[PDB]
Design a protein around this ligand. Structure first.
Ligand SMILES: Cc1c(C(=O)C2=C(O)CCCC2=O)ccc2c1C(=O)N(Cc1ccc(C(F)(F)F)cc1)CC(=O)N2C
Ligand SMILES: Cc1c(C(=O)C2=C(O)CCCC2=O)ccc2c1C(=O)N(Cc1ccc(C(F)(F)F)cc1)CC(=O)N2C
Ligand SMILES: [Co+2]
Ligand SMILES: [Co+2]
Lengths: 380, 380
């Protein structure tokens, strides 16, 4: 059931902002590893004396990487005279975030009809404000509320690129990489206590719960058309193997964003291209399932995937799960940086055609059991 | 003249250590951009709860990238019980370094006969101690003194890999990249005042001055066999164009390492390979000289380089300078990270055969004049 209870008009995921120590090196690594092109910048060369911010895009997916300059460059500025292009940025907040959590997501940004109204309604309904609505060049409004940990939910609304004060990137440094990634499917938080986290976020958004022994409990919040999807996990303590959610919270110094799931238009091509680059600057993937997992795929999805398509999943280490509505192909990277905290998921969904409805096939929760069983069977 | 006045036995450059916010992303970017292989690690997977450190190698060149974990992982440790593999590491020092200077070189490490003796003699002769000699697994001794700014000169000595507590990297993640870089030729500091910097460093090492209108004054300190080369620059103020040394000091928050010069066995292949990767995760190069510069090469080095070899320099943007002893091919990257501070030089030297003596052909100081003249001529 979908009660369509959003308290303001939400459109789509807009961008994800990483707070970094050095934005240049993270952005270049991510660009090569994920096949995202450099699309926009705001830095010293554009008159920004406060922060360096680089935008990568692939389809509709937008990854922003931001780091502070020396405060001495902007010491004479005040907020009314700032050269920052993102007015919510603060040197001390950014350094404190990074020192506490390491490399990770500061902002999950969604596009809304009216960022000022979304902010006001959110705070009226319990959201903890983080940055008030600020209108940029009479063209874009941006506002921020706390989501979980030190992650903010950022509202952006457009009267009619990316943000005022960003410049389009010179063609020569804009190499048109593309491994097939097209949009952000969902963004997932880890928290110590799921209940209070859900109540808080659903309280101020009106997002509804989307319909759904090893590590976690989780629930998913969704916008009216279920295209903005925000799962949240909590640990399940005193287990046989240690909870990966608890490990996250230990190494992250508390709650934060756990993973970003990136939809591909062709998950086979995306994984071929990403895996070719794992050991030359790109991303590594989690250890692949045993061959028993792929033999068991025939009985589970043999009506969705051909034998060749199942063998292609096996070559690439792709996992498969299935709803009553549709089927999910997914795979997980190793952690994106030094700490065993944030990672990326690549996904593609099949079914639920009307356009494809959001969350078709679920989130792969069946693959916890299915992986465990396949490895026990492979021990044989 | 070389008075061979080293106060202790110095062998060669050993490694360069970058202090990072996230060592993983910097190391992966550098590996792809420079063609260096992952050779060793010390991190959570090796029992290090303090710092993540990744070693890249190309020939004899060794680049170490280090970042701190959450102090909470090691809160119960004391120095006698530390799990750090580099005992001089300190969470607060590293975060303060990075917040102040951004991504850059913390340690210029040279191999010596006896790191404890080099440390004692250095401090007896005016060196400011930074980390005392510490013997690692009865096998390697490491000690540190201040060089300039927050950069340390690190002494390492071996009784008989890399460091105890580092593990050799699993083959699969060790892709054998190689664009031809073979060793560190020189490492260059920027300081506000050259005189006091020279007197200090030459005072405690016994390094001698190596024989040599636009931005700087500089001098070069050299070990007995002139294979350890440490140039130092100061700004020249009140100039037509602004001093690049002064710009460095402003954006770096004071003195620090300006550039690393990396010798290639085949600078043509290195630059072909690096330039292919500039816009897909690698490094960019400074704007190339005008064609007049390459026409002027015939009169300057036409007895060293063929016309084809001169045309190959032109295709790759390589600069050329010449001593009375030998000839230098060189080129400079754009800054390695967000700030206009540290960059890399790629070099190859021709002449001075006996092995090749250190510093053959100089450091390219003639290319300041030669670049200016060529651009004025190209304005035509
Ligand atoms: C996160 C995740 C999802 C997932 O998408 C999801 C939602 O979207 C919302 C509902 C709840 C949820 O879990 C689905 C399947 C899944 C994992 C998973 O996390 N794992 C471990 C794992 C550990 C450590 C690391 C790293 F080392 F990188 F930190 C990466 C993956 C292992 C594994 O076997 N299955 C099958
Ligand atoms: C550093 C340097 C050397 C050099 O090697 C050297 C020694 O080894 C010791 C003696 C003194 C010294 O200078 C040699 C030639 C040279 C430069 C040079 O720096 N430049 C500018 C330049 C600005 C900014 C940036 C960056 F934006 F990346 F910060 C990179 C290069 C411009 C240029 O035209 N010539 C010709
Ligand atoms: Co997921
Ligand atoms: Co140089």
């Amino acid at each position: 059931k979908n009660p369509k209870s959003d308290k303001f008009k939400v459109k789509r995921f807009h961008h994800i902002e990483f707070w970094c120590g050095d934005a240049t090196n993270v952005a270049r690594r991510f660009s090569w590893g994920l096949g995202m092109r450099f699309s926009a910048k705001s830095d010293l060369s554009t008159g920004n004396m406060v922060h360096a911010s680089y935008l990568l895009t692939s389809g509709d997916l937008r990854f922003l990487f931001t780091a502070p300059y020396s405060p001495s460059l902007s010491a004479g500025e005040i907020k009314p005279t700032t050269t920052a292009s993102i007015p919510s940025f603060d040197h001390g907040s950014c350094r404190s975030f990074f020192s506490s959590h390491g490399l990770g997501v500061r902002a999950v940004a969604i596009e809304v009809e009216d960022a000022e109204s979304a902010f006001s309604i959110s705070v009226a309904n319990g959201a903890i404000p983080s940055s008030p609505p600020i209108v940029l060049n009479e063209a874009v409004t941006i506002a921020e509320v706390k989501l979980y940990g030190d992650v903010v939910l950022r509202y952006v609304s457009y009267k009619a690129e990316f943000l005022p004060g960003f410049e389009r990137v010179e063609d020569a440094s804009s190499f048109p990489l593309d491994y097939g990634i097209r949009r952000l499917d969902h963004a997932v938080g880890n928290v110590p206590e799921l209940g209070p986290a859900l109540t808080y976020v659903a309280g101020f958004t009106g997002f509804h719960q989307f319909a759904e022994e090893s590590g976690l409990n989780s629930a998913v919040l969704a916008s009216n058309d279920e295209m903005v999807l925000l799962p949240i996990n909590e640990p399940v303590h005193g287990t046989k193997r240690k909870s990966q959610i608890q490990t996250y919270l230990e190494h992250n110094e508390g709650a934060g964003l756990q993973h970003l799931a990136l939809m591909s238009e062709d998950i086979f091509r995306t994984l071929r291209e990403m895996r070719k680059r794992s050991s030359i600057g790109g991303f590594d993937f989690m250890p692949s399932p045993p061959p028993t997992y792929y033999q068991n795929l025939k009985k589970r999805v043999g009506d969705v995937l051909s034998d060749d398509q199942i063998k292609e999943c096996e070559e690439l280490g792709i996992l498969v799960d299935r709803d009553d509505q549709g089927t999910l192909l997914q795979i997980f990277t190793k952690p994106l940086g030094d700490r065993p905290t944030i990672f990326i998921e690549i996904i593609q969904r099949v079914g639920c055609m009307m356009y494809q409805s959001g969350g078709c096939g679920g989130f792969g929760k069946g693959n916890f059991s299915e992986l465990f069983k396949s490895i026990e069977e492979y021990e044989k």
